[PDB]
Amino acid sequence: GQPVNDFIDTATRHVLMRQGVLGIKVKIMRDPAKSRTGPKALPDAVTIIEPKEEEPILAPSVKDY
Amino acid sequence: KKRKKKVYTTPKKIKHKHKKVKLAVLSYYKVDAEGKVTKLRRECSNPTCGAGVFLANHKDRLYCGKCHSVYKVNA
RNA sequence: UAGGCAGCCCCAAAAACACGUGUGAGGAGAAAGUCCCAGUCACUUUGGGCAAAGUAGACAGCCGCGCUUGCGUGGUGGGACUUAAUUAAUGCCU
RNA sequence: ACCCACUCGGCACCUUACGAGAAAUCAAAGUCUUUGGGUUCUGGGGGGAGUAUGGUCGCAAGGCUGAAACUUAAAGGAAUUGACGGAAGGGCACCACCAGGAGUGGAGCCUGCGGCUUAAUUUGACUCAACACGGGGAAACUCACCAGGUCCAGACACAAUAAGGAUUGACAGAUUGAGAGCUCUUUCUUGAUUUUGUGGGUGGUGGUGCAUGGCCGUUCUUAGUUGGUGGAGUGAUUUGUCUGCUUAAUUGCGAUAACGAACGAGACCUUAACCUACUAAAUAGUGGUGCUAGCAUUUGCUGGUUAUCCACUUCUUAGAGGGACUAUCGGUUUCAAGCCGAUGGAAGUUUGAGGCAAUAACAGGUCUGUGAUGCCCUUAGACGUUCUGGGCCGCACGCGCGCUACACUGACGGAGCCAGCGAGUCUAACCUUGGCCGAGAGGUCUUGGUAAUCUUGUGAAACUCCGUCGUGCUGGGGAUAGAGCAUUGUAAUUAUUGCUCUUCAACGAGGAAUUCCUAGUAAGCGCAAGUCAUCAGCUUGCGUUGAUUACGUCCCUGCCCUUUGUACACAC
Ligand SMILES: [Mg+2]
Ligand SMILES: [Mg+2]
Ligand SMILES: [Mg+2]
Ligand SMILES: [Mg+2]
Ligand SMILES: [Mg+2]
Ligand SMILES: [Mg+2]
Ligand SMILES: [Mg+2]
Ligand SMILES: [Mg+2]
Ligand SMILES: [Mg+2]
Ligand SMILES: [Mg+2]
Ligand SMILES: [Mg+2]
Ligand SMILES: [Mg+2]
Ligand SMILES: [Mg+2]
Ligand SMILES: [Mg+2]
Ligand SMILES: [Mg+2]
Ligand SMILES: [Mg+2]
Ligand SMILES: [Mg+2]
Description:
This is part of a larger assembly, with chains A (about 60 residues) and B (about 80 residues). With about 60 residues, chain A is mainly β.
């Protein structure tokens, strides 16, 4: 998926040796929260913000300015 | 595939070797007692060859060898 | 004529024994269908081998002929006996 | 006789692991390194071998007793994982089936491959996963095949050649396909710029893909793969990762010594479908008309513009967005996951379609895509390169992908006549309008377009209508061949191709068999693009017309999982 283009760089390289050619591949996924250009998280990383529970009131206690 | 052997129906050819000759002055320069030497053969009469090339004589006609020009002995 | 557009014309109804029109011992020319079939070589079937089946395929052999010793010139497929061929399988190794 | 509660003796059985064992398992196989109740028999790695001999018993068959020489590093037991099974069970999939549709296989031709001939008809790939594949429709080139002719484009170092000159290059005639001084008659010239030998390098569509990389195909477009803590086992290992239901899915619901997670899947991205809501626009249009004119006539159809007008972005385009989430209702199901129907909605098949796509692998393909490559070969009369010619297309034969037809749902003639995807030349001759010539292809002078501007509105075919034919191998069919007319190309010869006439081949719905396919899909039809100077019967995309059939199953095939068996583990 497109997260491989957003967060992953891929390299392939031939190395010459006296026995033959060797194929080396390096795949690196850097942190998605450090992207700072476009996407901020993974597409399925759904974080719900805290409810911020509040102590319920009983009396009206009208306030005026 | 692998290549087969090559046996030609014609014999081997040889390359041109230039005749190493021990003459450059006797062919064109005539011996004189005093030392006034005349030339025995013409030069490039083309405008852009020069006047010291001492062209190739033959039995019937003249060829340069260098300046490409063709002339006549009976001139 | 049952019907159809229907008076023509047009398209379309109606069975059984002859031991029978499927013989003889029938003889002969030309070719087809098959258990058993073919000498070597090729391939086709197989992942690949063999064992079996197949191919109008090359050499054969065989049948002969030519003026022959050497050879060439033609076919180079021929056999035997049955009321509609049925294919049950992987048949065995690497 | 039966019921209940006891008891002694017995055949067994169920749970557990006190305890044992290598484990399977075992109330004995327990009370064993914390080792001793009594007693009998038997074994000392595997073969040779229960063989030879001797004895003894037997009518015999044979029984009992019973070696050695020699030979070997394992043989064997239990259990685990995988693989396989002509074992069982459960799932899935138009590269499977059902029901159907179109076919192919039948006929002629195009093309690929095998076979044959040749000096060469170059090779690679042979089940799916080779056979219109090497994006390979090759006249030169492609070429690596063959036959001929040159050139080195043989670096660099050393030793000579020797400047009384190492050697390159030569018109002319012969030779040569050759207007190659290739070489022969010849002397002209360039002038450490060369030549020879060695070392060494280089070129090589030369070999080795079973030495290799990369890439691609396949398992697998399926749904599978892991570890953390805990549980089980001495251990390899197992559970988690599952009976069941559900899903495209290890998708979830649940069950539950498992609980919570990661990769894959999904999510994601691109494209298509909607938006009278935003932004706009002479490279896109629309309406009145600033302007004007035509015809029919009292306004319809238009022809010409944006300083030869204004307004607008519905249609057109691309930026930001919204919209679908299976939404509301009903039924059914563990009232769960879901599934189905109706309503609504542009969209209710993962909304349609693709891109990326897990772990582990294949002696899968390519050395001939690579100046990716180890090794090997060749390196000069070259297996290097170039020039000429031919070939890859050769034809007793076989198979596959294909096109054209067997006709009236038709063939031919006339008329109407709509797309969409795209491509474009001075980075030289590209897409072509218009005018003219020519039956035709084609030719001439130009024009517009480097591109939403022109081709182009690609005025496409199929199709709709009207005629000719009237069931006739016929006006269905166009195989083959002859003559000419033109294009592209140095070259059309083996006919590149187009065009006019003439011949009208087989084919009369095609066997065993075999392919693809569930919706704007199959199929019909045409169009654009790859290759290309030309040539498509091929391929990649596009649009027009647009079905029938079923919403299922494991019958066949293939794949997966579970149990099971194994003397397999290179794994049938
Ligand atoms: Mg008992
Ligand atoms: Mg012992
Ligand atoms: Mg022993
Ligand atoms: Mg099939
Ligand atoms: Mg069917
Ligand atoms: Mg057919
Ligand atoms: Mg055929
Ligand atoms: Mg070649
Ligand atoms: Mg040379
Ligand atoms: Mg553990
Ligand atoms: Mg596991
Ligand atoms: Mg995905
Ligand atoms: Mg070919
Ligand atoms: Mg259009
Ligand atoms: Mg005709
Ligand atoms: Mg004619
Ligand atoms: Mg058994």
